[PDB]
Amino acid sequence: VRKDPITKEWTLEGGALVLADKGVCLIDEFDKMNDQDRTSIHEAMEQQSISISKAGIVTTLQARCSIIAAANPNGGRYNSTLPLAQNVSLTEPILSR
Amino acid sequence: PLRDLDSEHVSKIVRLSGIIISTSVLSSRATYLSIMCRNCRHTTSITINNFNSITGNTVSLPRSCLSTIESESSMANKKNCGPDPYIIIHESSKFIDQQFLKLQEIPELVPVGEMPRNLTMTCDRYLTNKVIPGTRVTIVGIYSIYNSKSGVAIRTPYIKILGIQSDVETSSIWNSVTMFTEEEEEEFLQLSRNPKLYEILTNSIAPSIFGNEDIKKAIVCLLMGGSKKILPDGMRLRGDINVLLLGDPGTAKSQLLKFVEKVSPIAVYTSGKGSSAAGLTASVQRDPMTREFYLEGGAMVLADGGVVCIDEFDKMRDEDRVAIHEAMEQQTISIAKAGITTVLNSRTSVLAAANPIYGRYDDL
Amino acid sequence: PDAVFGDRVRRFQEFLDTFTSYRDSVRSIQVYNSNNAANYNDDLNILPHRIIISLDDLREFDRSFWSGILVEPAYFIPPAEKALTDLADSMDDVPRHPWKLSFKGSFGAHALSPRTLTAQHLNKLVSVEGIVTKTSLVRPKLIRSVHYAAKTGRFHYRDYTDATTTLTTRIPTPAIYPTEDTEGNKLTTEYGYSTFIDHQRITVQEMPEMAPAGQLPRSIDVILDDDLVDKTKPGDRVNVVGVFKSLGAGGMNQSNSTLIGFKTLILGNTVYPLHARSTGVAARQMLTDFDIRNINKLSKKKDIFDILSQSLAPSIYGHDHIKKAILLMLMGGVEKNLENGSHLRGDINILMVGDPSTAKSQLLRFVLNTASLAIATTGRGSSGVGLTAAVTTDRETGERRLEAGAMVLADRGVVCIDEFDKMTDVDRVAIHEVMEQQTVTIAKAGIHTTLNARCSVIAAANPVFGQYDVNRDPHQNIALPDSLLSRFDLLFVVTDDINEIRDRSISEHVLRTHRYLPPGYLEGEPVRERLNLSLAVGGNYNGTEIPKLVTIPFLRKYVQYAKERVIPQLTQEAINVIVKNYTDLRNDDNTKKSPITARTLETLIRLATAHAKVRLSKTVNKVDAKVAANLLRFALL
Amino acid sequence: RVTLQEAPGTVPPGRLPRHREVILLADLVDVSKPGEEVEVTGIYKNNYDGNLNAKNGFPVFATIIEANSIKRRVFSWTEEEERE
Amino acid sequence: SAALPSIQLPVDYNNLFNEITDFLVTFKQDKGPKYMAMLQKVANRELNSVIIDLDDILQYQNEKFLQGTQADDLVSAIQQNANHFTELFCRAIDNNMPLPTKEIDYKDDVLDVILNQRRLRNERMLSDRTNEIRSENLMDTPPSSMNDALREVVEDETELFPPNLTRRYFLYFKPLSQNCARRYRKKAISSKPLSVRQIKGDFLGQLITVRGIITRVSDVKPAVEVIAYTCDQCGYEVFQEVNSRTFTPLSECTSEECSQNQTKGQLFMSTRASKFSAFQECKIQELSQQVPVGHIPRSLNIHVNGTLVRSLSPGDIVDVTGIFLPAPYTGFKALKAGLLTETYLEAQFVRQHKKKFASFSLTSDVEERVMELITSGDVYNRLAKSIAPEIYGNLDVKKALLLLLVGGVDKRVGDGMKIRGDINVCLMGDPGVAKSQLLKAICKISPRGVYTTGKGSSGVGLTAAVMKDPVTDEMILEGGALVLADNGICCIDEFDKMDESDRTAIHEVMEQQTISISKAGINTTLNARTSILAAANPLYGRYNPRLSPLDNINLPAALLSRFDILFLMLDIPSRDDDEKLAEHVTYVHMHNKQPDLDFTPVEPSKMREYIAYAKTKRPVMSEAVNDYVVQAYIRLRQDSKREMDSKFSFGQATPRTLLGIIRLSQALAKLRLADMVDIDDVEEALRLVRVSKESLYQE
């Protein structure tokens, strides 16, 4: 929920996951997220919804979006001897989804 | 739809849907007001039944004294009372409540490069305080017009609310209902006389989950809670049951959490680090308008008197860990910031799920 | 002259004549004021001219006048205030400001919250409970200006009124500030002969525990007048009784032309600070004579120290020495202020560390409920600015001001810190100054301030391995720095060693504790939770007013009495004992949980003084010193 | 009101893209999604503002395009497309 | 009319003015009358301010009562309505002003020659008017009655410069003392120091005294009281008074000539002919003992005008006596209810709880106390042992703390290079050795002592911040804790807990006595001449003999060298030494005072004035003490080189050690009030340095 610095009027934006409801969310550079984004896509792939409690707004937005993501292995090169969990910074529950 | 509103809908009843993002404070408008002339002391009353107008005094105090034009008395004792001579007598005037709401189009269907569009709405009397921000509503109202002091003759649209319909009703302690009808009261008594009520309740818990009968029994026990004790020395004994589910991935513990979230009258499903924009435990931030401290939200507080389902319980922040510990045991959350100190209720049962290290659980 | 006004005045005369308590209260105020005036004449304080009125008594006497007071206070409160002024003037003729009215009792539908305040309650007397968030600067308001004309050598005056002064509206006659007399001579203002009445505006927001968890809060402005000024600080829980008023014209005039609406506020008649859990308002209880006699007859007994201690938390098995330490901390010792400004501590700090599920958090929650000014904090939840202070900016002046942290808010009080081990080092070194120097020094950008932080601290910590180990070094077990260890007066290691008889006894005690029913409650009915808001003035279940072990409401009457009344003084017979025990502890060969410094000596003095406070003794005795000395030995061995 | 800028391909290299305000009337509202390239035919006219511009020190007028027509430079299937 | 009705007040301004006039000519305290001799100095341009003491008026009333004549209570009337009595006293003074014995020369002030020209102009207009009226002879007709009517008509016709435009003095009311009020059974609410809590609306217009700490002081600015305009058309000077924060300038002339004429001249304002007051706005804050339980300290605005400017500095704990006056309302218009007013204190008198060392002067009354302290003998030990007498022992620590208070000789070289005279002391030891008590004792003793915490005082709380001052409407640099302790002592508790940025700030402070800030806000160097007293713990928290004293002291060598004295303070348990501490502490807790009755502690004010007189001294060193110091430094360097490989090392001796020895010797010479440094002072400095670290660690 953000306030426009000129209009002084608040807007609720669901983000890319909510906006792609009944659609497709295309995430480039999947390995380079911060913690807040990782929690957001974790919640979206877990229960297909996004819960927000900010600025007096307590609600749940539908996030039934298919996700196509692109990522790079650690070190810039994939290693065949190591398995998939070691090749990415992605933790196992987000790889399972 | 909000963006399909047109000039053809002006001054007509429109039915429209959206999400409410802000509700203002209640203003006081005059319905009946008794006015008295300043020097003339002529007494008049004004009755207002129309509160539809915004940024306008469609009914106001008269610009000159009404005693002369009436000529009510035979004596009629050039005397001019002056412009705006009337004074409102407040102790004999009557008032109602007016509320400003803001309706936004739902964020699921918004163009990608566009800011979502919103409308200012007005409600009065019994239509006020019937909806909180975040609620998805259908609204019947008059698409109306005001001028705000970008085009020589441009008016900002607004809605005079005639009816509010809440599509779904959020669950909390304040919105909880305690009243029960006689037929459901008797029907629930026929449930308790069944000797196999335990078995049918356990089978009703997650029917599409195979196995885990002991976990389903523990979920039945968790949903009921226990008897809470308040002692003469003041030491409070909790009755809510907290259950942890540790295990390998793909074993339907997250589905059990989701089912408990669905079946519980009050329930919040979050991760260990919280939600995308809803935190865990309790968040005390400042009011966006008045800069005063208020409780923004949090999983353990919004589900007071209910169940908090914490998935991925192992991964958690440090402040959330101590808040979760206190809120499990004492069923309260202590908040001590530089502005506000309080102890607030978090009387909720915790159902947590987690995975062990190195992937699967190791017997060694 | 209005006839119905006079009839209402006569009816309130009849009510005041019937109930003689208000007649005695007016006279008691008058004798206090006249005695102070006579003391100022021969060789101080003055009481305001207002009377607390019970609404229930008025309802029993006259239901019509009571409903008039509640529903139309503008037509009923001024006649009653006129009646009270007539009574006080009739009695004060033998030995000038008109008398005011305050209201107490049940309000029914008028007991509201800032969210529940609506426009149907306008022009009605309402009682509103909430939290004070903002308070304005106290500003004088000119009521009568006095001027001097030097040419004629005469004094003139002009009276000023505004709409907030009167409940009934009046024709607004704005009389300008006179600089001429009627003949054109220059007037000079006579400051000091003019009268200025103090004026304040506060904001009362609904309480964060009575507010919905996700919504933005609702608030209301309250205007306070001369004697109601500065009865609140921000953060207080309050109950304000006053008239919900509408003011001015809500844009209906031509000059105004906007939808702020009619501006609404409460003209406060009464402000009650309320004691809530973990707030800055201290709990106080009105002591009757019978309670004082009960406290004094318990004071003469020999087992009073082992009676109050076991009656703190009887629902907790064991921890008998910890209950004694909590009682002595609640007594709190005597603070010394020397002639050169040097300060000496009086209050006692207790650290508890040990195994989980040992009722440490339950003891913290008990001290939060039973102490007058206890504030509960957590380890990582609170921060450095959370406990000490912070700097913000107010809207009007634009200059920086201070927001008081938990330690400053708990001045002359109790801080209960849970999860003491998980705290950040910045907040630790903040706490080093608080626990010994008893002050908080803020040196920020532009501001340099010293705040009082005279606090008792209870801390609950855990060992770094999660469980205490006997074979390991206790310094390795606690792993807390030496300087923090020295600050705490008593450190208690609570291990969950298990024995068959002890586990049997604790199991029986907890099982018989879970089989309790409150009086007046059915067997199957659930106990309801009502949040305790107490007015601040100025294992056996059946404990009923000191049979064997005292009740918690009586025990904090005893603690309050011992704190206000007795200030015990150290004597030689206690001094010899504490000196000998301090020397023995300094030169002991044994290993101790707590290190031994000169702080242990002052700990012995504080504990002896606190035990003397239990006995209501003005002198500290040898028996006080020996029990203070062997209480310390348990916390060390 | 629609903000229209010069398409970045047509802009000369060192120069910045110019922009105009285009006023769309009753039938022309919401035909152009932001981020799409269109051709607008309309009357090029001046905005009238009180006391002109005090910052410049010159009697300088702002300009707009009152759009007579909008032409653009959809997952709807017909009955024949379903058969195909 | 009935619009402004009259009221009868007990005050009468006729016999009060006559009482004021008779008081100023007949008050002979016990050359001639006091205020008549003071007005002679005022007329001779040697005195700028007139201080009216209410003690003098009370004594005058006592003498009038003993004579038997009836006198009005002038003290009480001044106390209730001081704003009127300022103008009454100014009128009385202007009525009886002695002629100046001195003549005006070219070295006088511009204001003095302006006022002299105005007085000469007034005399010339009076003489010209009476001369032309005599030239009329409009009756051709009792000489003395004719002259009386003549002066009556002449003083009524002409326009003169009023006495407000011919006054060269400022008038202030000194409050009556409590001690003098006790003698006559007078109850002085004016004397009683109030907190900011207790200054309510009923104190408005009264002369009251407030005690508190000064937090903010604005810069001195010219506030115009009356504006002077010149008219080219008529030649008049038009003056308009100003009593608000804003004014509207006059455009058309309003003199007597241009009022009647059809063509009005245009007024041009002149700064030199207009009247200004030196104006300062200050904030006073409640002391910590004044603040009630659980409350935040409040602040009061003080208006300082005239001669009293620059007498208030931030951090000073003061008694400010002034007139409590209302001001026009500042704030939101919607929030105001009726005739709301702001408040301020128009300052009249300032008393310092701690007297500044630079303000010390050798008055007569100071000299006998200094001679008494000297003739008592053993001054060094007496002053050292009386610093924190509730703390048992630590005699050498208190000796170095006294040398910290006094300091050494600040050195200026003709090349411009500077060697600091301030001494820096570190007190590092085990917990519970009362080092925080010693810092608090020193840092209340010193007049400009600022107590800080390791993490409670941040970097911006130490150095500076670029803040806007709204009353003067300018962005100014506002100092931190080190600026507040300038030419004082900065009192840093928990020294090892500080972050590295504050360590760099004090690193620049400790030697160069400056702070160089080059940020986005500011590019300055500012003076931070603090002597630094630091308190610290070892690295493990408890000292252990297994580690080297360099190892368990987490202090870099460069920051170690800055400290002139570092005291290791070991808490070593013993049966005999702990018992003396125990009896000392128990006696202090029981009788609320010090055990040993064989010596009387010096009072902090007496200690402050003796230290001030010591700081006035400027000792120098001779050849023999220089040779002894050189030999001692050589021995110290060789000894440190020997100890370097061993565990006994306390660092490496540096030239800073030599300069610290010289500084301590000069401080010890200052305590003896000698202009030279002796052998014994150098030996005492050397033994202090040796027992600071080596002696206690050896034991």
Added chain:
Amino acid sequence: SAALPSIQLPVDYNNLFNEITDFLVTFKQDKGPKYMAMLQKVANRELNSVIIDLDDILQYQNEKFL
């Protein structure tokens, strides 16, 4: 409000109207009551004016007092 203050007067128009009503039905001067027979003539369009004599009211008050 204070613009039209109330005053207390000895006259009460409730028991005076009830006294007037009882006077018109029970005053039998010495067919049936006087003003009741007069109102019959008024109702029969035979009489146009009603004359209230204060002597009758004085006699009525005397009989009520006796």
